[PDB]
Design an enzyme around this catalytic site. Structure first.
Site, PDB file in Angstrom:
ATOM      1  CG  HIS B  41      -0.712   0.166   2.627  1.00  0.00           C
ATOM      2  ND1 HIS B  41      -0.631  -0.853   3.445  1.00  0.00           N
ATOM      3  CD2 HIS B  41       0.028   1.255   2.997  1.00  0.00           C
ATOM      4  CE1 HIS B  41      -0.022  -0.182   4.548  1.00  0.00           C
ATOM      5  NE2 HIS B  41       0.376   0.753   4.303  1.00  0.00           N
ATOM      6  N   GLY B 143       2.510   5.847   9.999  1.00  0.00           N
ATOM      7  CA  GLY B 143       3.826   5.814   9.997  1.00  0.00           C
ATOM      8  C   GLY B 143       4.357   4.472  10.184  1.00  0.00           C
ATOM      9  CB  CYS B 145       2.413   0.555   7.337  1.00  0.00           C
ATOM     10  SG  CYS B 145       0.934   1.209   7.784  1.00  0.00           S
TER      11      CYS B 145
HETATM   12  O1  LIG Z   1      -4.138   1.774   8.460  1.00  0.00           O
HETATM   13  C1  LIG Z   1      -3.208   2.288   7.891  1.00  0.00           C
HETATM   14  C2  LIG Z   1      -3.061   2.732   6.839  1.00  0.00           C
HETATM   15  C3  LIG Z   1      -4.057   1.813   5.726  1.00  0.00           C
HETATM   16  C4  LIG Z   1      -5.460   2.254   5.352  1.00  0.00           C
HETATM   17  C5  LIG Z   1      -6.341   1.308   4.631  1.00  0.00           C
HETATM   18  C6  LIG Z   1      -5.913   0.285   4.292  1.00  0.00           C
HETATM   19  C7  LIG Z   1      -4.476  -0.230   4.657  1.00  0.00           C
HETATM   20 CL1  LIG Z   1      -3.851  -1.900   3.882  1.00  0.00          CL
HETATM   21  C8  LIG Z   1      -3.735   0.456   5.042  1.00  0.00           C
HETATM   22  N1  LIG Z   1      -2.117   2.519   8.533  1.00  0.00           N
HETATM   23  N2  LIG Z   1      -1.797   2.046   9.868  1.00  0.00           N
HETATM   24  N3  LIG Z   1      -1.326   1.194  10.351  1.00  0.00           N
HETATM   25  N4  LIG Z   1      -1.453   1.202  11.717  1.00  0.00           N
HETATM   26  C9  LIG Z   1      -2.019   2.499  11.974  1.00  0.00           C
HETATM   27  C10 LIG Z   1      -2.087   3.013  13.351  1.00  0.00           C
HETATM   28  C11 LIG Z   1      -2.791   4.297  13.243  1.00  0.00           C
HETATM   29  C12 LIG Z   1      -2.861   4.988  12.193  1.00  0.00           C
HETATM   30  C13 LIG Z   1      -2.474   4.499  10.931  1.00  0.00           C
HETATM   31  C14 LIG Z   1      -2.172   3.303  10.919  1.00  0.00           C
END
Ligand SMILES: O=C(Cc1cccc(Cl)c1)Nn1nnc2ccccc21
Ligand SMILES: O=C(Cc1cccc(Cl)c1)Nn1nnc2ccccc21
EC number: 3.4.19.12
Lengths: 304, 304
Positions: B41, B143, B145
């Site tokens: 992603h 951030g 990820c």
């Molecule tokens: O969730 C996402 C981006 C995303 C959105 C939609 C789909 C996918 Cl694959 C990835 N990033 N993340 N990961 N852990 C987090 C903790 C707090 C804030 C953002 C965070």
């Protein structure tokens, strides 16, 4: 989101761990520059431990009796001295992996990561707090002596603790890196009282703020309180008195949540008087006090 | 003595963390040999995330669009491919700090350490479990990820998890190092159900054995039970059914404490039916399930 007992990345400290042996005894040492630091009880036999005269015991020891090994290389000991309860072994080679470091004596209620080691090799890392009664509740087995506690600021490792002993009560005691014990403890095999511990009130409030940041808000009520009314409740439940200095340290968390510190205190008061009623806060069924306000800000802002 | 949520020493993994950027997006990558692994992603914009066609998005990207930075050095990207939900960026330089490693798909109920990172820099390390519903309860911010989960055996790092997303429910989801998600999750911005979680019964028993090893024995009673009678209680309290395979994995702990597994089950049954009555076990007022029998043996024997 999410809130865990997070420790500092241990790499910088792993590169400092060495094995120190004196006769029969093997423990961990910390190699920084050309000096290896370790608990002075490395020079004792089990008979000596009951009441050791360390000056006398150290006199019967020469540089060649201290076997310092860094992984596979044997380090050459060119000097030895006792500074309080630590032995400082001067070696002829500076640790090429010495990070930027400081020696700091931490305050009670502050936290640090511990890198538990056996035979100079790291086994695990965990976060803990220096209790108000200057003990730590860590996880240590025989051989763990000389394992260190530290904090990391950007690229600087602040060493704050070296493990010396587990008392018959299960408490863990040790020194700063200058060999001064935290608390009233002495490095001798005698029964030692730790003294009454208290709950770190400013840390419980910081963790209540972490709960609010992470969606756990059931405990928030329509009430407020004063420092004096709250401290009457804190005294009853063996909590440290909350001061305006603690209120100020909580400022960033108050600003982030929009919940006044005294409003958070009122929630804590009802939590102390009524318990949790079987409910949980951040996956816990008890009030957690081993997270400082700085730990919460760091974990909830992403400080690397 | 003492029992803490201990993570593995992170040094070997810290030396693998890199920053991967594709246009606007910056996340963490894992640099092993001449390959940088990261969540796919990274190639998406916020508009793409609602329903991304990753094959199409990746086609509009060339090697020069992936900015891989290891600390201060910029790595040269000589190849790119998508393997399931991970991007594999071939670089022209092998990581000189690559440790002995393996890629493993962990089983639900197993544990691993997470090195949380931001901009390719490590911030903290914590231990967690792969839940029976294939989610993890970690601590992640935007951030994070590309941060990885791993286990260490002697000198071999077994990478088992890469962080991809936090769902609106607060659950954390990700993949093994071949890009296959744990659980039913897809890397797209859509509401996704995690499904019912269960308590890892064999892990709660292991932790009850850790409590007995560490002096907490109040919960030990004059009773015993059978697997079928215990499993009737486990089903009622949404616990995983205990099998003879779990009894066998608990063997070392049974031998160490001299307490039969079915006797420990009877204690667990009374604990489930009556609660803790306000008492604690290893500093906790709830039954802990994020320690495997191997974690307990390791922590209570000193495996480095
Ligand atoms: O969730 C996402 C981006 C995303 C959105 C939609 C789909 C996918 Cl694959 C990835 N990033 N993340 N990961 N852990 C987090 C903790 C707090 C804030 C953002 C965070
Ligand atoms: O307690 C000692 C040796 C000792 C005895 C008497 C005085 C002094 Cl200074 C040191 N070692 N340690 N430290 N933590 C331990 C955990 C479990 C088993 C042994 C442990």
């Amino acid at each position: 989101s999410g809130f865990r007992k997070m420790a500092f990345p241990s790499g910088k400290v792993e590169g400092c761990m060495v094995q120190v042996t004196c006769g029969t005894t093997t423990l961990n040492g910390l190699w920084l520059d050309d000096v290896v630091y370790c608990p002075r009880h490395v020079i004792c036999t089990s008979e000596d431990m009951l009441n050791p005269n360390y000056e006398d015991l150290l006199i019967r020891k020469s540089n060649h009796n201290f076997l310092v090994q860094a992984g596979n290389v044997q380090l050459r000991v060119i000097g030895h001295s006792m500074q309080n309860c630590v032995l400082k072994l001067k070696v002829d080679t500076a640790n090429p992996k010495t990070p930027k470091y400081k020696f700091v004596r931490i305050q009670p209620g502050q936290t640090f990561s511990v890198l538990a080691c056996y035979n100079g090799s790291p086994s695990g890392v965990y976060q803990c707090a220096m209790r108000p009664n200057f003990t730590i509740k860590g996880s240590f087995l025989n051989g763990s002596c000389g394992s260190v506690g530290f904090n990391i600021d950007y690229d600087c490792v602040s060493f704050c603790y070296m493990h010396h002993m587990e008392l018959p009560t299960g408490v863990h005691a040790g020194t700063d890196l200058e060999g001064n014990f935290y608390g009233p403890f002495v490095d001798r095999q005698t029964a030692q009282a730790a003294g009454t511990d208290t709950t770190i009130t400013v840390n419980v409030l910081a963790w209540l703020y972490a709960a609010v940041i992470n969606g756990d808000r059931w405990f928030l009520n329509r009430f407020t309180t004063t420092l004096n009314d709250f401290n009457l409740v804190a005294m009853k439940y063996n909590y440290e008195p909350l001061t305006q200095d603690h209120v100020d340290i909580l400022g960033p968390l108050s600003a982030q949540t929009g919940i006044a510190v005294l409003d958070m205190c009122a929630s804590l008061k009802e939590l102390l008087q009524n318990g949790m009623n079987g409910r949980t806060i951040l996956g816990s069924a008890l009030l957690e006090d081993e997270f400082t306000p700085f730990d919460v800000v760091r974990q909830c802002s992403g400080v690397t």
